[PDB]
Enzyme design. Structure first.
Site, PDB file in Angstrom:
ATOM      1  CG  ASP A  18      -1.845   1.153   1.303  1.00 27.32           C
ATOM      2  OD1 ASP A  18      -2.040   1.826   0.272  1.00 27.32           O
ATOM      3  OD2 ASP A  18      -2.387   1.403   2.401  1.00 27.32           O
ATOM      4  CG  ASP A  45      -3.749   4.667  -2.173  1.00 27.22           C
ATOM      5  OD1 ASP A  45      -3.070   3.697  -1.791  1.00 27.22           O
ATOM      6  OD2 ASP A  45      -4.857   4.957  -1.676  1.00 27.22           O
TER       7      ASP A  45
HETATM    8  C1  LIG Z   1      -8.157  -4.652  -0.390  1.00 27.90           C
HETATM    9  O1  LIG Z   1      -8.136  -3.518   0.466  1.00 27.90           O
HETATM   10  C2  LIG Z   1      -6.919  -2.852   0.662  1.00 27.90           C
HETATM   11  C3  LIG Z   1      -5.761  -2.986  -0.130  1.00 27.90           C
HETATM   12  C4  LIG Z   1      -4.593  -2.333   0.223  1.00 27.90           C
HETATM   13 CL1  LIG Z   1      -3.230  -2.485  -0.740  1.00 27.90          CL
HETATM   14  C5  LIG Z   1      -4.536  -1.461   1.304  1.00 27.90           C
HETATM   15  C6  LIG Z   1      -5.699  -1.216   2.056  1.00 27.90           C
HETATM   16  C7  LIG Z   1      -5.646  -0.132   3.098  1.00 27.90           C
HETATM   17  N1  LIG Z   1      -5.366   1.221   2.473  1.00 27.90           N
HETATM   18  C8  LIG Z   1      -6.293   1.637   1.370  1.00 27.90           C
HETATM   19  C9  LIG Z   1      -5.801   2.919   0.671  1.00 27.90           C
HETATM   20  C10 LIG Z   1      -5.733   4.066   1.702  1.00 27.90           C
HETATM   21  N2  LIG Z   1      -5.287   5.326   1.057  1.00 27.90           N
HETATM   22  C11 LIG Z   1      -5.398   6.516   1.682  1.00 27.90           C
HETATM   23  O2  LIG Z   1      -5.916   6.703   2.769  1.00 27.90           O
HETATM   24  C12 LIG Z   1      -4.802   7.644   0.874  1.00 27.90           C
HETATM   25  O3  LIG Z   1      -5.478   8.861   1.153  1.00 27.90           O
HETATM   26  C13 LIG Z   1      -6.808   9.027   0.741  1.00 27.90           C
HETATM   27  C14 LIG Z   1      -7.504  10.130   1.289  1.00 27.90           C
HETATM   28  C15 LIG Z   1      -8.864  10.330   0.984  1.00 27.90           C
HETATM   29  C16 LIG Z   1      -9.508   9.423   0.121  1.00 27.90           C
HETATM   30  S1  LIG Z   1     -11.211   9.585  -0.289  1.00 27.90           S
HETATM   31  N3  LIG Z   1     -11.991   9.777   1.257  1.00 27.90           N
HETATM   32  O4  LIG Z   1     -11.385  10.839  -0.953  1.00 27.90           O
HETATM   33  O5  LIG Z   1     -11.695   8.378  -0.907  1.00 27.90           O
HETATM   34  C17 LIG Z   1      -8.831   8.355  -0.454  1.00 27.90           C
HETATM   35  C18 LIG Z   1      -7.485   8.154  -0.152  1.00 27.90           C
HETATM   36  C19 LIG Z   1      -4.781   3.651   2.843  1.00 27.90           C
HETATM   37  C20 LIG Z   1      -5.259   2.312   3.466  1.00 27.90           C
HETATM   38  C21 LIG Z   1      -6.866  -1.985   1.791  1.00 27.90           C
HETATM   39  O6  LIG Z   1      -7.886  -1.984   2.737  1.00 27.90           O
HETATM   40  C22 LIG Z   1      -7.950  -3.218   3.477  1.00 27.90           C
HETATM   41  C23 LIG Z   1      -8.824  -2.997   4.685  1.00 27.90           C
HETATM   42  C24 LIG Z   1      -6.624  -3.814   4.067  1.00 27.90           C
END
Ligand SMILES: COc1cc(Cl)cc(CN2CCC(NC(=O)COc3ccc(S(N)(=O)=O)cc3)CC2)c1OC(C)C
Length: 377
Positions: free
Chosen positions: A36, A220
């Site tokens: 990630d 990301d």
């Molecule tokens: C399969 O699931 C996953 C696969 C992988 Cl590799 C990683 C993760 C966790 N990971 C998802 C990405 C996230 N990225 C941001 O937080 C960047 O900042 C952001 C800020 C606002 C927004 S918005 N509110 O406008 O949408 C979006 C992003 C960080 C956390 C997953 O979740 C599972 C539970 C482990």
């Protein structure tokens, strides 16, 4: 290629992220870890959970050191709580080194582990600024670079329909074709970049570029979709709909609420437009663009059982931040996270999903003035 042993070291599901094998502790305990670039904590399930095939057993590791401090991490989707500590960590199909890294042992979680995902932890590759509890908790890659001679750079080749490669410490020329185009990392927290123009089938969306990055635009690997700011999303959908008028779809489809399935091997890719994102270049007034195909922003949904129906979900959605370039964007390219030179490189992937009419692309250079004014201060 000297990095051949790292090729194809990633595995995953068509929307559940990509993971790499990581070996922790002594004796060795290997687990599947999500890659990630949108987060900065290294954490692994460390207690039984219905959706976990295996977990980290700290008591069985003689090299584990409890930092005696708790950690809580809430993600856009889900959250977990655990205990902080350090242990020895190696990536069997990664760099030939072993480092002592911070590791969060997940003891309780909510909507984190998925039923049949095959991963048991997460590897946050972003910077310390966004690490929890705070920026004092050194992220894994930072430990790697400080403790070893491995160059401060990694690259990701995420191949869609799943597998891919995470090359650490270098660039593998067999994973891409053409040239690598670099955009500056604006700030070292998330991998923040600046989008200066957006086109749908060569047609400029004509919005003030500040809207594209309002708050922040990032790369990301942890986010599945290409996420756009509300105002940008609306304009983009209107344009995509107009360009795909050959066929009509329900409003809910563009909102990701409804799915549309096609007979096996009959998806009319040719009726959907290509989407181009222009990124700030490394030279004044110079930019380059990356173009994605519908095969990228239309992702296949967990098939029923080898049925004669291919169901797809619109993989472009609304964001409450700036533009989030998720997997749908990365899958069409080889992406170089050149931390050492504070830049991100894009090149056409050797495993890009295209057809006989169109192909994903990275082209440049283009002349774009006042690109600096596109970023949020
Ligand atoms: C399969 O699931 C996953 C696969 C992988 Cl590799 C990683 C993760 C966790 N990971 C998802 C990405 C996230 N990225 C941001 O937080 C960047 O900042 C952001 C800020 C606002 C927004 S918005 N509110 O406008 O949408 C979006 C992003 C960080 C956390 C997953 O979740 C599972 C539970 C482990």
């Amino acid at each position: 290629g000297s990095f051949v042993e790292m090729v194809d070291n990633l595995r995953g599901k068509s929307g559940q992220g990509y993971y790499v094998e990581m070996t922790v502790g002594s004796p060795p305990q290997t687990l599947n870890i999500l890659v990630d670039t949108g987060s900065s904590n290294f954490a692994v399930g460390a207690a039984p959970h219905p959706f976990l095939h295996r977990y980290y057993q700290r008591q069985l590791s003689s090299t584990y050191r409890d930092l005696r401090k708790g950690v809580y991490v809430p993600y856009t989707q889900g959250a977990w709580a655990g205990e902080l500590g350090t242990d020895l960590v190696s990536i069997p199909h990664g760099p030939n080194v072993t480092v002592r890294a911070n590791i969060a042992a997940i003891t309780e979680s909510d909507k984190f582990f998925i039923n049949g995902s095959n991963w048991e932890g997460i590897l946050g590759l972003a910077y310390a600024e966004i690490a929890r509890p705070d920026d004092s908790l050194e992220p894994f890659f930072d430990s790697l670079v400080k403790q070893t001679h491995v160059p401060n750079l990694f690259s990701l080749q995420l191949c869609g329909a799943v597998g891919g490669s995470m090359i650490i410490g270098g660039i593998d020329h067999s994973l891409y074709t053409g040239s690598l185009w670099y955009t500056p990392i604006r700030r070292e927290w998330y991998y923040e970049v600046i989008i200066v123009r957006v086109e749908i089938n060569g047609q400029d969306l004509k919005m003030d570029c500040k809207e594209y990055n309002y708050d922040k635009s990032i790369v990301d690997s942890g986010t599945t979709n290409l996420r756009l700011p509300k105002k940008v999303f609306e304009a983009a959908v209107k344009s995509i709909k107009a360009a795909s008028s050959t066929e009509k779809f329900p409003d809910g489809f563009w909102l990701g609420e409804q799915l549309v399935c096609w007979q096996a091997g009959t998806t009319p890719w040719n009726i959907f437009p290509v989407i181009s994102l222009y990124l700030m270049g490394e030279v004044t007034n110079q930019s380059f663009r990356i173009t994605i195909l519908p095969q990228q922003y239309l992702r296949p949904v967990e098939d029923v059982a080898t049925s004669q129906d291919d169901c797809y979900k619109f993989a472009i959605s609304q964001s409450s931040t700036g533009t989030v370039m998720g997997a749908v964007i990365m899958e069409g390219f080889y992406v170089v996270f050149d931390r050492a030179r504070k830049r991100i490189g894009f090149a056409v992937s050797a495993c890009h999903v295209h057809d006989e009419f169109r192909t994903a692309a990275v082209e440049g250079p283009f002349v774009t003035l006042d690109m600096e004014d596109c970023g949020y201060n």
